[PDB]
From a paper:
The regulatory cluster consists of three genes, aioX, aioS and aioR, which encode a periplasmic-binding protein (PBP), a sensor histidine kinase and a response regulator, respectively. Arsenite-bound AioX is thought to act as a ligand for AioS, the sensor histidine kinase that upon auto-phosphorylation, phosphorylates AioR, the response regulator, which binds to a conserved sequence upstream of a RpoN promoter. AioX exhibits a typical bilobed structure of the PBP type II class. In this class of proteins, the ligand-binding pocket is located in the space between the two domains.
In the initial single-wavelength anomalous diffraction (SAD) electron density maps generated from the crystals of Se-Met labelled protein there was an unaccounted electron density in the putative ligand-binding region near residue Cys106. The electron density was consistent with the presence of a phosphate ion, from the crystallisation conditions, and its location would suggest that Cys106 might be involved in binding arsenite. The crystal structure of the phosphate-bound AioX was used to solve the structures of the apo and arsenite-bound forms of the protein by molecular replacement. On the other hand, a phosphate ion found in the binding site of AioX formed AioX-specific hydrogen bonds with Asp210 and Cys106, which in PhnD correspond to Asn175 and Gly65, respectively. A comparison of the X-ray structures however, indicates that while AioX can bind phosphate, the resulting structure does not stabilize the 53–61 loop conformation seen in the arsenite-bound form. Furthermore, even though the structure is similar to the arsenite-bound form, with the main conformation of Tyr88 akin to that of the arsenite-AioX, electron density for residues 53–61 are ambiguous and due to the disorder, we were unable to confidently build a model for residues 55–57. Within region 55–57 the structure had more similarity to the apo rather than the arsenite-bound form of AioX. As we were unable to detect any binding interaction, based on the conditions used in the ITC we estimate that the Kd for phosphate would have to be greater than 2 mM (data not shown). As AioX and ArxX did not bind phosphate in conditions tested in ITC, we conclude that AioX and ArxX do not bind phosphate under biologically relevant conditions.
Residue numbers in the entry: 42 to 56, 59 to 304
The structure:
């Protein structure tokens, strides 16, 4: 009858030195949780989210958009803090020397999105379009998914995309780690503030021991040297407890896109 895995499984999607950060995060969570934690990476948000929703992961770091989409099947564990707050923006980016004044001038672009289930890499911009009565197929000459925010930036930097939609946290971090790459882009539009991508758990595992230990591992990550090392590399400050109401601005956009679709 019970169908337990051999280990605690923590899901995420892809993170420059990503192996170094992943190793440390895996070792930290193992050290904190008190037993082996395996990091399970999948390429897309809906793949990580479905694994979580089916109880095939004990927790996962997902986007607020899929979190709110599967809100009744999932519980929030903790939210990251960046620049002192559990919030971030979507940046609509163009080439550094592109002469244009605003978003409306991106009509006819080739546009790079990150993932159809990304708040900052799809939804926010999809909201801009829907508010103006258009979809990506109508407004742009082409759009595609890069399946990563670093890739959106590279797509715009290289000229394959005229414009892109990116996580503004990612853009700011890369500005410091790959400055010559990010200097080939510039921020055309910054969105409003949304809840930072949270760690969530299947709603059935609410009071489970693995979830409780994961949660403390996140909230106490600043109190251990290896935990601090992970936070430093991600340029994050820690994790805090939030409730679903922190994600209301995301749900509101989801509804605009539906209402107006």
């Amino acid at each position: 009858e019970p169908m337990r895995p051999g280990v605690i499984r923590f899901g995420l999607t892809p993170v420059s030195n990503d192996l170094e950060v992943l190793d440390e995060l895996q070792a930290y969570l193992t050290q904190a949780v008190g037993q082996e934690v395996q990091l399970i990476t999948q390429r897309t948000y809906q793949e990580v989210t479905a694994l979580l929703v089916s109880g095939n992961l004990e927790a996962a770091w997902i986007c607020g958009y899929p979190f709110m989409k599967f809100r009744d099947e999932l519980d929030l564990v903790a939210t990251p803090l960046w620049r002192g707050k559990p919030v971030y923006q979507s940046y609509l980016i163009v080439g550094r020397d592109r002469d244009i004044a605003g978003f409306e001038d991106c009509q006819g672009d080739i546009h790079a999105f990150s993932d159809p289930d990304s708040n900052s890499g799809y939804l926010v911009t999809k909201t801009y379009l829907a508010e103006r009565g258009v979809s990506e197929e109508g407004f742009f000459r082409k759009s595609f998914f890069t399946y990563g925010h670093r890739n959106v930036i590279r797509a715009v930097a290289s000229g394959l995309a005229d414009s892109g939609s990116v996580d503004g946290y990612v853009w700011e971090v890369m500005k410091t780690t790959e400055p010559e790459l990010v200097a080939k882009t510039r921020v055309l539009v910054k969105s409003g503030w949304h809840g930072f991508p949270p760690v969530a758990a299947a709603a059935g595992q609410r009071k489970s021991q693995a979830v409780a230990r994961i949660r403390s591992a996140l909230l106490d990550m600043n109190q251990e040297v290896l935990g601090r090392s992970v936070l430093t590399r991600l340029q994050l400050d820690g994790f805090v407890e939030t409730t679903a109401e922190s994600y209301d601005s995301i749900a509101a956009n989801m509804e605009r896109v539906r209402r107006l679709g």
